[PDB]
Design a protein around this nucleic acid. Sequence first.
RNA 1: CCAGAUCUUAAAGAUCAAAAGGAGCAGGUAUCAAGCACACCUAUAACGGUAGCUCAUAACGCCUUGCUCAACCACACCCC
Lengths: 175, 112, 51, 72
Amino acid sequence: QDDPPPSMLLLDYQNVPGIHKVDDVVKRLLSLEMANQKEKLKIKKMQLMNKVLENPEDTSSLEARIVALTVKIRNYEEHMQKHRKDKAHKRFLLMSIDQRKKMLKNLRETNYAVFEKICKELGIEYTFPPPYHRKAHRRWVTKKALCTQVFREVQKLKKQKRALRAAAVAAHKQG
Amino acid sequence: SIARSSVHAKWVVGKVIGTAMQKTAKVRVTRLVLDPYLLKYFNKRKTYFAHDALQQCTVGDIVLLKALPVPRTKHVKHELAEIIFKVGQVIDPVTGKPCAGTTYLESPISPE
Amino acid sequence: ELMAWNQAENQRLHELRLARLRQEALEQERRQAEEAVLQAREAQAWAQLKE
Amino acid sequence: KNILKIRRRKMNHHKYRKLVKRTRFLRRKVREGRLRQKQVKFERDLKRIWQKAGLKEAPAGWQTPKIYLKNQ
RNA sequence: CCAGAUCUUAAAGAUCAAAAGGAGCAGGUAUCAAGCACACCUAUAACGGUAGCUCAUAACGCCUUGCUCAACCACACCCC
Ligand SMILES: [Mg+2]
Ligand SMILES: [Mg+2]
Ligand SMILES: [Mg+2]
Ligand SMILES: [Mg+2]
Ligand SMILES: [Mg+2]
Ligand SMILES: [Mg+2]
């Protein structure tokens, strides 16, 4: 988790001349201290888009959109941790995650170098969709578990039988 | 000069579905087939295993397969010949330049 | 004969294209001048308000 | 007008609900039976698998849980 | 794509073409939705190693059934 420090002097007032000469109080009113949450999101967005990107000027580029959407997503995460039962924001979160991923799968298919970088930097991990979405239910889950255990047994038994064969034939061939 | 394969598939081109097995690419090939009732063309798909010597293949790459003279297994009748489009890194065959989608990554008119 | 013919044809088209793209590059720089002007104006206006 | 259709369904449904009330514990019995049957066919399906794979006993530590007979 | 048999002739041909294959097409039923080892590598042909393979573009089942006809496929008392 990052920490856009309380004193950080909101985005719009950072580049106005001679700000640092002003007395403590006004500096304080322009701080992230007296700020909204939306100001901390503006800051977080700028900072991320500077760490991660190449051309922070292009809003249009896929990568840019992915970074922005990722800020929004981390924010819904926070909100959802506080309000467990808000179903509306759960919707925004899951939805907006799917949009991120759609865009990622679109990067990977077009500019791969960048996609690689982004996944590393935002810690997103890109999984390929499965073929066959099916609901794993009690019967199937159990049966499959069994079939897997059966398999592991059988091939272990073939291994033991081949150990016995090798030992027998070797101790025979020697004398 | 006899080296042949009895397969109809002597050359195909297809997408790489999955790489999960050692040195073997799963490759979805797709052809146009004419639905007789509607007289229209739809894409029938079929998979081929291909032998990848250097394990060169990401998922999603468009790839070209040549039929293997002697089948490596029952399911492997093709060897991967070329990688036609690497996934998301594509060099335009026309102008020889890197491109991401419909955009040029390095302009062809800026040689120097 | 035909493969060579095709080759020469592709080269012909290649030169045409290079012409077209140089032209587009020029028109594009013109656009960059325009946008730089407008963004400078609004940068100023914003700086004034905030100040 | 259209209600004639609705009315019909209305009646059907009523009569059926009524019937489920009368026939209730008969129904209970039959459904419990079908659940046992289900569990059994399941066990057979599993046994069949580990046997056709040549094993004699089921693999180590295999209890074959009761899924359908799951307490209500 | 052809091993083989046969005919002719030195050979080459030719006729019938088993096994193996697959561009495509091919009965009903999805209230049959999962199959449960069904893949690959290594290399020497084994030891060993990866953990795969099929499937809603219908796998795996169940039912019905000779056929697309110069013909073809199958059977030959029953237990394929
Ligand atoms: Mg009635
Ligand atoms: Mg012959
Ligand atoms: Mg044949
Ligand atoms: Mg019959
Ligand atoms: Mg018979
Ligand atoms: Mg008789």
